Structure formats: structure tokens, C-alpha cells
From Swiss-Prot, chain A:
The chain holds residues 273 to 544 of 1087 of the full protein. This is Transcription elongation factor SPT5. Residues 41-113 are annotated as: Interaction with RNA polymerase II. Ubiquitously expressed. It comes from Homo sapiens (Human). Disulfide bonds: none annotated. Methylated by PRMT1/HRMT1L2 and PRMT5/SKB1. Methylation negatively regulates interaction with P-TEFb and RNA polymerase II. It is found in: Nucleus. Belongs to the SPT5 family. Component of the DRB sensitivity-inducing factor complex (DSIF complex), which regulates mRNA processing and transcription elongation by RNA polymerase II. DSIF positively regulates mRNA capping by stimulating the mRNA guanylyltransferase activity of RNGTT/CAP1A. DSIF also acts cooperatively with the negative elongation factor complex (NELF complex) to enhance transcriptional pausing at sites proximal to the promoter. Transcriptional pausing may facilitate the assembly of an elongation competent RNA polymerase II complex. Residues 1-34, 113-144, 165-196 form the KOW domain. Interacts with SUPT4H1 to form DSIF. DSIF interacts with the positive transcription elongation factor b complex (P-TEFb complex), which is composed of CDK9 and cyclin-T (CCNT1 or CCNT2). DSIF interacts with RNA polymerase II (Pol II); forms DNA and RNA clamps that stabilize Pol II elongation complex while maintaining the nontemplate DNA strand in the transcription bubble and nascent RNA in the exit channel. This interaction is reduced by phosphorylation of the C-terminal domain (CTD) of POLR2A by P-TEFb.
UniProtKB/Swiss-Prot annotation, chain B:
GO terms for biological process: nuclear-transcribed mRNA catabolic process; positive regulation of nuclear-transcribed mRNA poly(A) tail shortening; positive regulation of translational initiation; transcription by RNA polymerase II; transcription initiation at RNA polymerase II promoter. Gene3D superfamilies: Nucleic acid-binding proteins (2.40.50.140), RNA polymerase Rpb7-like, N-terminal domain (3.30.1490.120). SMART domains: S1. Its main location: nucleus. Keywords: DNA-directed RNA polymerase, Nucleus, RNA-binding, Transcription. The gene is POLR2G. It is found in: Nucleus. The keyword Cytoplasm does not apply. Core component of RNA polymerase II (Pol II), a DNA-dependent RNA polymerase which synthesizes mRNA precursors and many functional non-coding RNAs using the four ribonucleoside triphosphates as substrates. Pol II is the central component of the basal RNA polymerase II transcription machinery. It is composed of mobile elements that move relative to each other. POLR2G/RPB7 is part of a subcomplex with POLR2D/RPB4 that binds to a pocket formed by POLR2A/RPB1, POLR2B/RPB2 and POLR2F/RPABC2 at the base of the clamp element. This is DNA-directed RNA polymerase II subunit RPB7.
Swiss-Prot record, chain D:
It comes from the Eukaryota. One of its GO terms (cellular component) is RNA polymerase II, core complex. This is DNA-directed RNA polymerase II subunit RPB4. PANTHER family: DNA-DIRECTED RNA POLYMERASE II (PTHR21297).
Length: 237, 171, 82, 128
DNA sequence: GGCAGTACTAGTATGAAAGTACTTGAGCTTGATC
């Protein structure tokens, strides 16, 4: 669980919502979560998220206590500048596997190495050696590469490595706006890598960490599995 | 690259073809079914050179078609990464190079063109040239490319080439 | 095996005559040339049954002996039981 | 995984023989003459047509006998079908260029020797 | 007007078969040693 990471509250109307860990409590009891409220401002009560309209809740009244942008309302819910900032038990949230969406990032390092990929050494006296991954650990990978013309296994920390690739090999986009798309890399630039997708020849330029070596042919189906490229759709009646 | 190999086929004959011209129909059926086709295993079947042997026909159970195994010699075209071949430029665009290698198409990415070859839209026929105007690549020119990768989408193969190495380009 | 030394019954077993009149009628039923003069016959099973009594059916039967070998009998060489 | 620049080809292409664009053109010309004459056969496919003009357009030895002599010339040299066929089709003029285009040739012969074969080819070339 | 406690509701978490085959234990016989 990390501060400013995103977790999902287990219960309430806020159940499953992506929420940012505003504050990790030292006691490890609760965490302050940044949410967008799902409230009717007690007008309907004798819903989709919307930014907290402090003026509206004041208009509706009820349990409202304004203190600047910080406002306390109905059940000591805390809000500030349109968002919620309320503590929730750590036991009450889902701390792992959450991952915000890009949209959630708008609302509110990493290492990925797999045995079999070709990597390059970015620094050190061992710089510009390329080789294939034997094994992997989470930080100092102790990536045990088998470098070209080297029968020995060395150890490299993740931070010392990058995912290299000569032009013409198949690549997959691991994470990004393009993730799931595949292609052959035509040209490699400093940290820049350009490639043509398999589905369409429309160009793609991505960072060196966002590609991996996988020999599989392109899927041809969107995330969600409902639609696929080249299909007929109804846009409006 | 062009090859001369031995291939096989199963000719499914509709029952109407039977009668007198039976063996002849198999050969004519074969020529029509394999010539022009392409596969990932062998590539483009350019033409059937000779028919070595015709297998005894076996009635397929539950269907009218009877299958005659056929051994034939054919000419195939199967490209490989790193091989240099001559192509004809067919179209100049600001997006890259549209080329053709025999019956197979090949795309040369603009990113794989030396920086000296600026694209020039204002020229009468679109073309690719060096600012020095020394070398100009346009429609109908013969160029040397290196195949960087191949793909097979719906029995048809296409490739991607590059002009980054020395002694490539205009011929 | 050779045309000599064939060891099998010359008669057509009722299993072979069941699959011959079936396979032949399936061919006739798709535009296939008819060996025998057909007279008022729109039904393929009756046509294929007629070709059989006249021994006009163009099929050779491949009989696998149990040891892995085989023999090829044409439908004319065999003797129709019924 | 595979790469012709290192003569790593599939097992299937072992018993096969490479064909020069000139030889291909000849073979296609004979098959066409047969297709042409003896009617009652649909016109050939587009793949053919495109290949017929492309092969012709790049054929350097227009004479039957010449092609055979070139083939045999190289034949008596320790060459792999791929390396052989590639040099005959591209006909490079210098050892340097040759090695660059076909890296598998590195260390196979001395530049001098490679240039002898090249020079011989050039001599055999049926210029237009 | 606010905070704490209690109660209710919702969700989540756990007699009256027969036979055959295999394994284990006990007993008997043979071999080796004193």
C-alpha cells in the first residue's frame, strides 16, 4: 500500500471506486482516500460520481459544516475542493491489483522483465552487451543474461538495463495508450522506437520500456473482446 | 528468392467431372487451384513445372468428392530477412515507399531512407530525391532493398524493407 | 498384392454391396455420369441399384487383409450375391 | 529466429534448388507457350503476369546457352545455393559491396578470389 | 445540537451388498555360526 497509490474501498456507495491514498496513517489503522462523491446532496433522499458542489450542499442544508474549501457533511464525510478526503480502514480497502485508469488519473518506478527477452546493458563497464534473460527478481533482477558470445551468466540490477531490439523483430506494447498492439520495429532512436502495427500500417512511436519481444501474431481484437478491427458498427440510427 | 521444389495436393473432384476426361480434369483442376496462391510454409506458387505422379483416387466417406493425391514440381517465391532483391517503385507518398518485388508487395518505411533523400511533393511526378538532386527515386525506378521482416495476412505475404545499409537504393 | 494369388471370397459381401450402392447413389445424386440407360428414373438409389445388376459401376474395392496387406477387386470381378 | 544472412533456413528448403531470375524467365516462357497454344484453358493469373514482366525486366542473360555457362562457372566453387544464387542475381562489382550485402560470405574466400569470381561474372554479363 | 450505543439489515462464508485383490503378519524351514 503506498501513499498516493490507488486502492478500492470494499464497501458503501464508494464500493470498488478507485481512490487515491491521500494519507497513510502511521498507526497503520486507516488511510485517507481521495474520492469523488456519489451524492444527491440529500435532495432526493427522504448515483454517478460528481465533484462535490459545496455550494449545493449548503443550499440543501442538513448536516453541512463549511470550513473554507474543507466541508464536513452528513456523517462526518470530509470533502475539500470538490473531492472527498476521508479515512478508511486499511482492512476496508483493496491495496493490490487496483491500478487506476488514465481517466482516474485525470480524476485524481516499475520494472517488467521476463525470461527470454533481449536486453542491453545501459551503463557500466558491461555497457552495450546484449543478451537474453535467464531469470528474474523484482529489483536487482540479478538478471542473468546470456550475452552474445558469452557462456557465462552475469547479474544486473533492473536499473542498469533496458529492453533492446534490432529492427525487424516482432514486439508487443506492454503498457500505454497502445498496449496490446503488436508490430515490427523499423527504426530505433535514442530512447525512441518507431514501428508499424500488424493490424494497420499506421505508425507508432513508443518508449523502450513499453515494448517486449513476443513472437505471437497480432490478436486483432479490442480489449473487452466485444469488437474487432474491421467490423461494421452502427454509429447512430 | 526463387525455388524449385516438390509439392503435394489433394484434388477434390465434384461428381460431374467424372466420365471420359477424368485424369485430364485432375491436371487442369490442379493448375487452376495452386497457381497464383500463396502460403506461409512455401510462399507464392508461381507455376507448376511438372506432375510427377497421380495417386489412386479414394472415395471420401459421406461426401461426393473423391480425393486424388498429386505430386508436382513447382516454382515458389519465399523471401527472407536480410536478403537483397530488386524491386520496382510503384508509388511515391509522404508516408513511405510503396514497392513491389515480383508478385509480392514490399513497403520501405520513410524512416529507413537516408536523411539525404528528402521527400518532394512539388515535383511534377512525386518522387524521392537528395537535396543535391543527384539521386532521385520515382515511379518505374529500380532499387535494391533489404527485407527486414515478413508477414502473411489472408494467404498473401508482404514485407518491410530498409535502405540504411551501403550500396542500396537507386540502381 | 499381385492379381495372382488373391485370397478372398469372389462374392460381394452384403457389407460391400451396401456401401457400393450408397456411394454410387451419392455420386449420381450430384451430376455424375450414368453408365446405364435410365428409363423413367428420378431416384438415385434405383439408378445405382440398376447399374449394379448390369455390373457397370466404376468402383474398385480395396480389401485389407488382416496382416496389413490389401487386395483391389473391381465391382465387375466380384460376383453379386443377390 | 530464422535469418538468411546466416544461411539458417528451414529443414524443408534443403533438397530444393535456387533459380536465377534468368532461368525463371525461361521456364515461365515455356509454360506460357504451352498455355498459349492448345486452347480451352483460361488465361494465366495476375501473379504470373506480374512475375513474367518483373523476371524479364531484370534478366541479364537473354541467351539460353549463356545462362547455363554462368551457372556452371559458379557451380565449380564451394558455394551454398543461397550465396550462389544471390551473387548471380545482384551481380555486385566489388568485393567490399558483395560482403556488405551478403554478410554470410565473410571469411569464405579472399577478396582477391571473390573479386575473380565477380570479375568473371562481369565478363559473362550480357550487357544491353 | 452532538456523540455514543444499540438494534436491524445485508452480505459473506461454510438391519435387510457382495466379491475380489492386495497388504501385512505370523509361522515354518533352512542356513550359518558357535
Amino acid at each position: 500500500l503506498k501513499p498516493k497509490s490507488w486502492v478500492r474501498l470494499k464497501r458503501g456507495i464508494y464500493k470498488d471506486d478507485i481512490a487515491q491514498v491521500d494519507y497513510v496513517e502511521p498507526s497503520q489503522n486507516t488511510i485517507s482516500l481521495k474520492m469523488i462523491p456519489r451524492i444527491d446532496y440529500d435532495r432526493i433522499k427522504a448515483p454517478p460520481q460528481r465533484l462535490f458542489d459545496a455550494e449545493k450542499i449548503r443550499s440543501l442544508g442538513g448536516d453541512v459544516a463549511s470550513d473554507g474549501d474543507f466541508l464536513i457533511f452528513e456523517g462526518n464525510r470530509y470533502s475539500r475542493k470538490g473531492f472527498l478526503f476521508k479515512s478508511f480502514a486499511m482492512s476496508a480497502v483493496i491495496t493490490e491489483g487496483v491500478k487506476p485508469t488514465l481517466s482516474e488519473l485525470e480524476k485524481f518506478r516499475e520494472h517488467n522483465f521476463q525470461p527470454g527477452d533481449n536486453v542491453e546493458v545501459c551503463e557500466g563497464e558491461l555497457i552495450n552487451l546484449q543478451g537474453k534473460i535467464l531469470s528474474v527478481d523484482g529489483n536487482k533482477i540479478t538478471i542473468m543474461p546470456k550475452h552474445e558470445d558469452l557462456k557465462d551468466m552475469l547479474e544486473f540490477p533492473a536499473q542498469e538495463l533496458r529492453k533492446y531490439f534490432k529492427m525487424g523483430d516482432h514486439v508487443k506494447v506492454i503498457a500505454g495508450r497502445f498496449e496490446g498492439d503488436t508490430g515490427l520495429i523499423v527504426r530505433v532512436e535514442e530512447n525512441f522506437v518507431i514501428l508499424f502495427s500488424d493490424l494497420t500500417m499506421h505508425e507508432l512511436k513508443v518508449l523502450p520500456r513499453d515494448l517486449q519481444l513476443c513472437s505471437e501474431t497480432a490478436s486483432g481484437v479490442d480489449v473487452g473482446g466485444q469488437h474487432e478491427w474491421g467490423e461494421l458498427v452502427q454509429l447512430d440510427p | 528468392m526463387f525455388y524449385h521444389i516438390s509439392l503435394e495436393h489433394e484434388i477434390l473432384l465434384h461428381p460431374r467431372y467424372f466420365g471420359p476426361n477424368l485424369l485430364n480434369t485432375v491436371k487442369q483442376k490442379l493448375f487452376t487451384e495452386v497457381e497464383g496462391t500463396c502460403t506461409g510454409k512455401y510462399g507464392f506458387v508461381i507455376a507448376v513445372t511438372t506432375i510427377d505422379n497421380i495417386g489412386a483416387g479414394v472415395i471420401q466417406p459421406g461426401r461426393g468428392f473423391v480425393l486424388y493425391p498429386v505430386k508436382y514440381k513447382a516454382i515458389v517465391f519465399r523471401p527472407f530477412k536480410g536478403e537483397v532483391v530488386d524491386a520496382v517503385v510503384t508509388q511515391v507518398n509522404k508516408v513511405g515507399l510503396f514497392t513491389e518485388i515480383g508478385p509480392m508487395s514490399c513497403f520501405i518505411s520513410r524512416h529507413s531512407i537516408p536523411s539525404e533523400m528528402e521527400f518532394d511533393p512539388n515535383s511534377n511526378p512525386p518522387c524521392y530525391k537528395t537535396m543535391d538532386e543527384d539521386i532521385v527515386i520515382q515511379q518505374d525506378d529500380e532499387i535494391r532493398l533489404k527485407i527486414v521482416g515478413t508477414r502473411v495476412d489472408k494467404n498473401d505475404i508482404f514485407a518491410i524493407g530498409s535502405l540504411m545499409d551501403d550500396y542500396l537504393g537507386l540502381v | 498384392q499381385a492379381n495372382q494369388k488373391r485370397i478372398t471370397t469372389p462374392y460381394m459381401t452384403k457389407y460391400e454391396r451396401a456401401r457400393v450402392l450408397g456411394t454410387r447413389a451419392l455420386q449420381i445424386a450430384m451430376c455424375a455420369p450414368v453408365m446405364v440407360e435410365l428409363e423413367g428414373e428420378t431416384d438415385p438409389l434405383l439408378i445405382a441399384m440398376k447399374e449394379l445388376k448390369a455390373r457397370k459401376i466404376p468402383i474398385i474395392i480395396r480389401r485389407y487383409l488382416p496382416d496389413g496387406s490389401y487386395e483391389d477387386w473391381g465391382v465387375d470381378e466380384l460376383i453379386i450375391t443377390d | 529466429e530464422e535469418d538468411a544472412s546466416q544461411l539458417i533456413f528451414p529443414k524443408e528448403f534443403e533438397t530444393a534448388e535456387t533459380l536465377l531470375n534468368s532461368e525463371v524467365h525461361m521456364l515461365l516462357e515455356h509454360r506460357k507457350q504451352q498455355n498459349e497454344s492448345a486452347e480451352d484453358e483460361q488465361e494465366l493469373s495476375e501473379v504470373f503476369m506480374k512475375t513474367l514482366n518483373y523476371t524479364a525486366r531484370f534478366s541479364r542473360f537473354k541467351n539460353r546457352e549463356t545462362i547455363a555457362s554462368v551457372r556452371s562457372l559458379l557451380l565449380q566453387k564451394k558455394l551454398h545455393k543461397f550465396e550462389l544464387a544471390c551473387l548471380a542475381n545482384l551481380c555486385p562489382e566489388t568485393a567490399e559491396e558483395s560482403k556488405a550485402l551478403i554478410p554470410s560470405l565473410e571469411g569464405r574466400f579472399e577478396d582477391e578470389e571473390l573479386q575473380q569470381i565477380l570479375d568473371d561474372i562481369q565478363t559473362k554479363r550480357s550487357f544491353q
